[PDB]
Design a protein around this nucleic acid. Structure first.
Ligand SMILES: [Mg+2]
Ligand SMILES: [Mg+2]
Ligand SMILES: [Mg+2]
Ligand SMILES: [Mg+2]
Ligand SMILES: [Mg+2]
Ligand SMILES: [Mg+2]
Ligand SMILES: [Mg+2]
Ligand SMILES: [Mg+2]
Ligand SMILES: [Mg+2]
Ligand SMILES: [Mg+2]
Ligand SMILES: [Mg+2]
Ligand SMILES: [Mg+2]
Ligand SMILES: [Mg+2]
Ligand SMILES: [Mg+2]
Ligand SMILES: [Mg+2]
Ligand SMILES: [Mg+2]
Ligand SMILES: [Mg+2]
Ligand SMILES: [Mg+2]
Ligand SMILES: [Mg+2]
Ligand SMILES: [Mg+2]
Ligand SMILES: [Mg+2]
Ligand SMILES: [Mg+2]
Ligand SMILES: [Mg+2]
Ligand SMILES: [Mg+2]
Ligand SMILES: [Mg+2]
Ligand SMILES: [Mg+2]
Ligand SMILES: [Mg+2]
Ligand SMILES: [Mg+2]
Ligand SMILES: [Mg+2]
Ligand SMILES: [Mg+2]
Ligand SMILES: [Zn+2]
Lengths: 136, 52, 84, 119, 50
RNA sequence: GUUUGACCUCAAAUCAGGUAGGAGUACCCGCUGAACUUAAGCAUAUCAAUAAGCGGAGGAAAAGAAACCAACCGGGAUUGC
RNA sequence: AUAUUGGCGAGAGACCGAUAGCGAACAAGUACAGUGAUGGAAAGAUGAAAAGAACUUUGAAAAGAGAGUGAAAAAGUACGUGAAAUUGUUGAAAGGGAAGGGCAUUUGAUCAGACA
RNA sequence: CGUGGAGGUCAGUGACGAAGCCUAGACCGUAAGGUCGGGUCGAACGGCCUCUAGUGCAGAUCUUGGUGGUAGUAGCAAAUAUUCAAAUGAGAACUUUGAAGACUGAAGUGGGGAAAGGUUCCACGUCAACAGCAGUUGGACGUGGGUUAGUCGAUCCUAAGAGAUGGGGAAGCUCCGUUUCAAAGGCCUGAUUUUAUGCAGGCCACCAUCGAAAGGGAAUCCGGUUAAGAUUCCGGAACCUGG
RNA sequence: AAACUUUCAACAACGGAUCUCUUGGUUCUCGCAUCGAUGAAGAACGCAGCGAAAUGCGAUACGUAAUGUGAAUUGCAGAAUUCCGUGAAUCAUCGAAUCUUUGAACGCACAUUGCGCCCCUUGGUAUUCCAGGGGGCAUGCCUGUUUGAGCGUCAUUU
């Protein structure tokens, strides 16, 4: 057969890579504080007849969902909302769920002024943990 | 090392030469020339089934 | 007569000293070094000649300039002088 | 023993030139004596004194040339910064930080806001 | 050859200056491990090959 | 006006200022490209789109924000496990 | 986020221990060979400290014998320990064209236990 | 049964001597082996419960290293040939000088060079190894000295040939070709009938470079001098080229 | 009976096994991004008071300057250090320099330490000659400057 011995991948560095990933997460959190390490992701329905019984996290909120929530795409991107321009809305229940998520996020975040004294607060590292995906 | 015992230019001298048919170092002018090579029974050769 | 008597007629030189690598490998009639490839711009080397690459590679000589590059990088390519 | 650089640096060009010539004469005399006495430790300090005088002279000349070329667009290449070849060929800070007017307007209008998930 | 080139003569001069045994004071140094000149050359033993 | 010029194209200068070569090459992006070997017999497949050869980069390179996947209640740049 | 048997700087091992581990633990890609492309070795260990044996004597000398240094010279730059093959001397024994081995005992040498 | 390493344990053994090695001594096992004494040695090592593997040799014309018989044996018998005295020296068949006998016999065992070698040349000191005997000697070992050019060569020219540029192939490393397929570079005159501080009129033409220490080619001889230099130094007498 | 051959034992040889050592190798993991026409990698030749290597360096040559440390280096020689301190050293650090002949290698060549050309300057009683010193003269391509070529196109009577 082929010369397989010249291409053997052994993962001796599994623990080292885990340590490096945790260090990278801590470094990025310190550099980015106090905003979280992740953007707000919408709830979408999984494709195909095998997985369409579940909902999961999509890439970003649609322009229609952002406009219904009352924001612009640029401002939502600046305040930490993932926006996807190619996903389309054809499901009223999903549309309402995403609008509700955006409104709850806006209620639960605090945006610091561009000029002036900052109200100091501890950073929460996971928007996904703060706003979990729930199966309806 | 995967290259241990294999960084040698040696070839067998053939059958009927009044010496063993192990590959032997070519060239000349040094004590290395004519010595056995590549075998697990040879000094400086490769071990049997090298560890991986 | 192809052995010992024929060995007595050897008094010429196929190769002389090469200006680039200093070996006795500059073929006189071809005006080309069989070791480094002079006078071609590139230095001769082959992937089947791993031992030759090791013999002639970087670090076998003095590295007159390249030795200090690591120290200068570590200090950040600084300019000026220590102000006591 | 030998000469000291900080004592040399307080002198003029002609004094340094005369000192260098005297040191060269002394070196010639020591090399004459070395033919009879193989161990002559003074040769080392005379050689180092010659090297130090040359170093100070070159320092003064190069500083004068730097002052002459101060505040000019084009400098001698041995007075320019060394760095590395790639570092010299790289873009400057101004060129790297250049932006288009459209991008500048976008950056002014919508910068990365500072926020936290607390309330 | 009698009519030789300067490159050859310069290499010959360097070989002549290299042709020597060890200085005796080398042997007296602390932790000295050099006991003989292992690169010594003679005109009738190893040819310089130009 | 058989003159005086405006242009176009093409040159020259040790003209003013720059830039390319070569090295290294573990990893990367292209080109080019066998045979030993292992089998079969709609004259072949395999080794292998590999070794060797050539060209070109960086600290990573390449890829990358759909002329995509799908056929679902649809997903939504690229990469890797 | 992925790759990294080159470069620079670090930390480690149920790995090897000088015929092993890289070819190279040492002035190793060295010495040496070849016209050339290239081929390519062997080679670590006195002692804690050189204190590396002053001096006398024999010898032309290398050296020997005394002496001395040192815990040790049963460590003398042949140097930690110092196996086997093979060799010398001393002592015992056998041997009329091999020797070696097994069972049993004689002879010579040598030796342990039990000794209340 | 035995070996290298690993976890645990024996608060295991050890400078009043660990490991190793030798041993006409002692014991236990059917055996693989285990244990004790003596000598030598000088710094580490073992029993048991487990873990682990590059774990056990008489062979492979096995590998590397070392050593025997052969064996003081075969041999050191081509190139006609050696001898006497003295000196030196511890030591003389082999060194030095003298005295003799011979040889190469000018197509030399003579005197110079080319290729090649690279200090082997010469002096002083000097014998461990090398000179298949010897050695006081040496092309050996140690320390130094020595190669002087306008006229001798290279350097210059071109020969068979080698090989850039202008171009044209080739994915490309590179290949063809050597004057073509090129705007490929020098010189003369001028007060250019003046338009006023801008160069006008003419002339001739073919290709880089490398390639000979025996081809071609400017010009030097004599005498003396050194331990070793010599048409080069010294003395005398010349010549060439350029200005 | 000796000698000789062989066996056994003690000591001495030969040789370098064994044991104990180890500034080396091998494998794994982590961090970083930095060669070169401002001349790299590599090569040759040189350099130390007395060196042939290894190591370091370039006619300023086992090196100069700067900063730190604070008394060595050592084989010998020689500095010591005003010790009440701008100060050893084969020390550390390294930001200023020097950096032969080369090498992609760049005036033309190179089996030659061969042959030019340009500018400035200096010394030889020098308008002419010679020599020394300093600095230069590669190719492809880009932007610009200057000088040009060609009925290729066009304008050119108050
Ligand atoms: Mg091995
Ligand atoms: Mg033949
Ligand atoms: Mg011939
Ligand atoms: Mg030929
Ligand atoms: Mg390949
Ligand atoms: Mg780079
Ligand atoms: Mg990355
Ligand atoms: Mg990229
Ligand atoms: Mg788009
Ligand atoms: Mg080894
Ligand atoms: Mg011993
Ligand atoms: Mg024995
Ligand atoms: Mg013991
Ligand atoms: Mg095995
Ligand atoms: Mg055996
Ligand atoms: Mg068997
Ligand atoms: Mg055998
Ligand atoms: Mg005989
Ligand atoms: Mg005869
Ligand atoms: Mg005759
Ligand atoms: Mg006759
Ligand atoms: Mg003899
Ligand atoms: Mg002689
Ligand atoms: Mg001599
Ligand atoms: Mg050609
Ligand atoms: Mg010529
Ligand atoms: Mg001639
Ligand atoms: Mg003569
Ligand atoms: Mg004369
Ligand atoms: Mg020539
Ligand atoms: Zn070469």
């Amino acid at each position: 057969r082929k010369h397989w011995q010249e291409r053997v991948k052994v993962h001796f560095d599994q623990a080292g890579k885990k340590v490096s990933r945790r260090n990278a997460r801590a470094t990025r959190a310190a550099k980015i504080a106090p905003r979280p390490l992740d953007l707000l992701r919408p709830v979408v329905r999984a494709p195909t007849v095998k997985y369409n019984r579940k909902v999961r996290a999509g890439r970003g909120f649609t322009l229609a969902e952002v406009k219904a929530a009352g924001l612009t795409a640029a401002y939502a991107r600046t305040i930490g909302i993932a926006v996807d321009h190619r996903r389309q809305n054809r499901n009223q229940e999903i549309f309402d769920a995403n609008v509700q998520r955006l409104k709850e996020y806006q209620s639960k975040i605090i945006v610091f002024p561009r000029n002036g004294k900052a109200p100091e607060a501890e950073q929460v590292l996971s928007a996904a943990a703060t706003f979990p995906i729930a199966q309806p | 090392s995967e290259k241990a015992g294999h960084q040698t230019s040696a070839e067998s001298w053939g059958t009927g030469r009044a010496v063993a048919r192990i590959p032997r170092v070519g060239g000349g002018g040094t004590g290395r020339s004519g010595q056995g090579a590549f075998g697990n029974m040879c000094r400086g050769g490769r071990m049997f089934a090298p560890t991986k | 007569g192809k052995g010992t008597p024929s060995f007595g007629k050897r008094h010429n030189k196929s190769h002389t000293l090469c200006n680039r690598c200093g070996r006795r490998s500059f073929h006189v009639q071809k005006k080309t070094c069989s070791s480094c490839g002079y006078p071609a711009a590139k230095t001769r080397s082959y992937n089947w000649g791993a031992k030759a690459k090791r013999r002639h590679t970087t670090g076998t000589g003095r590295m007159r300039y390249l030795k200090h590059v690591s120290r200068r990088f570590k200090n950040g390519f600084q300019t000026g002088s220590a102000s006591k | 023993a030998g000469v000291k650089a900080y004592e040399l640096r307080t002198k003029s060009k002609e004094q340094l030139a005369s000192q260098l010539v005297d040191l060269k004469k002394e070196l010639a005399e020591l090399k004459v004596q070395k033919l009879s006495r193989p161990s002559l430790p003074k040769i080392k300090t005379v050689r180092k004194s010659i090297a130090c005088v040359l170093t100070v002279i070159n320092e003064q000349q190069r500083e004068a040339v730097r002052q002459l070329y101060k505040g000019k667009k084009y400098q001698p290449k041995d007075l320019r910064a060394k760095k590395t070849r790639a570092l010299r060929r790289a873009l400057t800070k101004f060129e790297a930080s250049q932006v288009t007017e459209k991008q500048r307007k976008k950056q002014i209008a919508f910068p990365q806001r500072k926020y936290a998930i607390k309330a | 050859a009698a009519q030789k080139s300067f490159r050859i003569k310069q290499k010959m001069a360097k070989a002549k200056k290299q042709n020597r045994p060890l200085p005796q004071w080398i042997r007296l140094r602390t932790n000295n491990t050099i006991r003989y000149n292992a690169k010594r050359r003679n005109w009738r033993r190893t040819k310089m090959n130009i």
